[PDB]
Amino acid sequence: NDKVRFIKDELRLLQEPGSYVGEVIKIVSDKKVLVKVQPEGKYIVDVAKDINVKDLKASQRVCLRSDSYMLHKVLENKADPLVSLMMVEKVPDSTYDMVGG
Amino acid sequence: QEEEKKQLEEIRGNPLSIGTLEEIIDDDHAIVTSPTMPDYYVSILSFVDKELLEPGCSVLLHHKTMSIVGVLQDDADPMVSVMKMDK
Amino acid sequence: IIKKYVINLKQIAKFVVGLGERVSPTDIEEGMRVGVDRSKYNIELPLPPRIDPSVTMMTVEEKPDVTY
Amino acid sequence: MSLQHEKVTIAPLVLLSALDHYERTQTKENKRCVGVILGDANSSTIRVTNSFALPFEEDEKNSDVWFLDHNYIENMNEMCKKINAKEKLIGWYHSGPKLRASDLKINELFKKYTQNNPLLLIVDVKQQGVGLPTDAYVAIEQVKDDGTSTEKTFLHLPCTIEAEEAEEIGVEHLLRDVRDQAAGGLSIRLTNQLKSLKGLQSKLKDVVEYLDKVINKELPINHTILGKLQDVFNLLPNLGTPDDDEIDVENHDRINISNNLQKALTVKTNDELMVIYISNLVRSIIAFDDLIENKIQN
Amino acid sequence: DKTENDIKALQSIGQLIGEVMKELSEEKYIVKASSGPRYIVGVRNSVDRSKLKKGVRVTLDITTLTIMRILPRETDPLVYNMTSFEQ
Amino acid sequence: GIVSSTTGMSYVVRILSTLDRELLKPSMSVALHRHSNALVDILPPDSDSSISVM
Amino acid sequence: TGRDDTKETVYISSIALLKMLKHGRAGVPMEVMGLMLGEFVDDYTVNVVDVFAMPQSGTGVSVEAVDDVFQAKMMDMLKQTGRDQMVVGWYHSHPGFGCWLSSVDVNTQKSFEQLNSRAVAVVVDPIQSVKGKVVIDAFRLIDTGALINNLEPRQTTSNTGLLNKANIQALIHGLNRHYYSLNIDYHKTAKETKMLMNLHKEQWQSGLKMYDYEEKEESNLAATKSMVKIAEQYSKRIEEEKELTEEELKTRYVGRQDPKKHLSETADETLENNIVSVLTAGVNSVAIK
Amino acid sequence: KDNKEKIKNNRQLPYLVANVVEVMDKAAVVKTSSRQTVFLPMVGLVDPDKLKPNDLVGVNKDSYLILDTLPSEFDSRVKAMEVDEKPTETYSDVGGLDKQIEELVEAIVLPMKRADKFKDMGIRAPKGALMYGPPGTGKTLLARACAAQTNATFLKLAA
């Protein structure tokens, strides 16, 4: 039963048109945050009930649902070049002794 | 308080797409450029005083029909916050 | 102006349109802005030519005063 | 006219239409319906896109007596060419139940309209057919060579269904049935194996009975059917071919891979035994703790 | 006949052309549109895949973005001129 | 996951579950349904990359 | 006190449904329009037996695109064929938008309201349907007066109903201005269902057709080789795997995209087919000869 | 008439304006002013021969088709600049440099009037003169006076 449920759930998520990504530029007391929605221009938009002006932090990257621009989740997640350089690099090998002389 | 509140929810459907006030013509209309290449000859409707608005101000416009629903911006950019390091 | 008018929008897209309530021929000139409706695409008001003077009129300062 | 009529595709909408027309004229139980079929032609695939009822009166005293309102077929055509130019006159449907020799006459009247050969689509609206309740037939003109004059006849063209993309997504969404044959799982094709045999057995009977009827009812000798049956006995598989010996080795390959894949499923089930079993052993421990933890608070 | 041509043309509806950017498979082919964005479109079994080649212009329905058939390759006057010259 | 379209409109699009995340997670061209605007299937790295193998 | 003002459940027949997907979807980007022919019974049951496309117009959909000249003309042809039934409404297609009425389509609705007060305005969005039947809705006018004096509750007295919810801007505009929506239902006969699936003789004829044996060889070879590769991985899975925390196990032994499970699936499909293959071949050989 | 009234409906404003980049030939490639590229079936009502490169055309807003033709749009800035022959500075009043005046007049004036003679002999007439070197030598000026003499419309233009 659960497998039939699972395949269906996968189906329903994908539907969602839009779905973006902004960054909280600053916070105001009006149950809103000014977001520079990154692919778009700017939007001053109200918070979703799930995550509020309290929780939000300035310069935190955020997910957004559809063309509504309601808050989904906060993303810690940041694209930076240093991080990208680390992935090429991987876990640095190797014991002191081998170097040792 | 109750006054402010009731009104604000009604008028403001969201999201609200910001503009820049380029000029005023005295007849409670303004000419603004939106982020879209077409600019829009808008009504000033409700809230913010006509006097208080001086050209070069950044402004909140309502998404269904573009109208001056107020200001809370004052040409806020992230660049100013970055620089600002009173800390 | 072709005696309807050929308008060019700022997204760059050209239409042949017409007068709305009643817009005199003599008001619409090359370079003159126009107000047209979202999607019914007709002139209401001719609008003064260009939005670019307004931008640059901020820089302009009037007759400064200093004693010689 | 045109001789390109090699394939016939049929929208399901047509099918739906043919019953609808039958009931709105209130024709029933050996009252006949003739309508125009519209669609594309002068092309190999005749694409029957639509159909529309026409004025038709049926007389039972004289079967060669009917009404058609000739002017109306012209008029209606004019309207639909304006709606969509791709639709053209392409013939006429009959509701059956069967083809007749009056349908030959009827064909002739549509021939005038049509710049293609008029397609006679026999839609049985009752759907008594086990398979296809729809036959497609094209009026051809050929010398029947036997010492008989030029004969005009309706030669069977196999037909298939087809659906436009736009309709089809909606057809599928309407349907949700488990099907007599979907080509699904083992048990489903297995049903089809029982069906397919009983199919053949009825099908062969029809042949035996025609052979009786030739010498008892004097049906005209059709040297053509009998010619095709010669090819059946002639090309017939036989045993003691080296082909049997080849099939016989093949049998052994097909069971042997099956056997090994059976054995492999044994190992997977045996794996799950262990995993669930390990959990149980742990479950014993958590259960004992419950009793142990109750003692400590007391 | 000439006034009938218009009514017919409105029912034929403007076509989008791309061009074969890159064969990927028999069943799926990568085209880049003339209008713009890159797409993966499909090919009908009505049109043989041997005809379809890299840099041949192709025509696709808007509705579903799938290649109906081949078109003759775009007429380039330049390479015609080059051939002609000598006499 | 996070992707850009052909035009660059940055979408956060769901990865249809039980697909590759062993090579998908590094950059590679990928295909998104047009209507759904979701990541429904993957492309080999060969698509839209110059063939230097000579 | 007054009127219920009740909004009909719009009972859309399958025949009518199929012509709507065909004409509208194909005709993208250009909008298409047409009337709905039906019979109205009860105060809540409208049966829309048929639809047709009225001849295209370059004004697309407007008050004047639609016409009485077109209306009458078509009626007269169907009049003779006895398939004539009263106009119960009008449809048109929006292929670029979701289900809602333009400011213009309300005015168009208003002329059909005057004709017949049970007249529906149905907005068909067919390209941005991925099942066909979805995102098509039927509507009816509500007066400007009706909104003020609060006659929206009456219409849905004692019925669960469906009020549509997709499109937030365009919907809330429609819900509180353009029209009131109620549920839209599809009905069909069990004579027709038989026709929609289509029975064929080639369903069963294909079951005694014996495909070539090169193709059986390929399947035998292929399926077995494949599971050799994931059988190495399976050895890796069960090498230890018995230390605590289940999540930990699934990343380390790559029990994500489960190799045990994939072995089972490839095995089952081939096992099932090779049994069909022996079963058909045995039936063919005795049965023929 | 039935067709013509349908055609009128399409023609009802608004409609798109576009140009014909070419006729491929039959079929026509239009370049729209919406910045997309559309290959459309050539509307047989419209003469293919009448159409030329950069012939302006009316194109229906919905299904893109060559409905009608339009007069090519014109640039008043270019029109205004044309006819600036007047005042004729006169070569006399243009300060110094006899030599350059004599040279310009060979290249320009004489071929203009003697054009029959040029055809007969068959040699090319001067296909343009470029003036270059230091400013202040009256590059401007010369052209204005010369054009006036040749009675030929003087566009003062910058690419």
Ligand SMILES: Nc1ncnc2c1ncn2[C@@H]1O[C@H](COP(=O)(O)OP(=O)(O)OP(=O)(O)O)[C@@H](O)[C@H]1O
């Ligand atoms: N040959 C001349 N005699 C007298 N005055 C001259 C002469 N040439 C130029 N000047 C004066 O200088 C002014 C400016 O000319 P300018 O320097 O623009 O010259 P030009 O040769 O046309 O160069 P350019 O267009 O490259 O700037 C003229 O309006 C004229 O009064």
Ligand SMILES: [Mg+2]
């Ligand atoms: Mg100069």
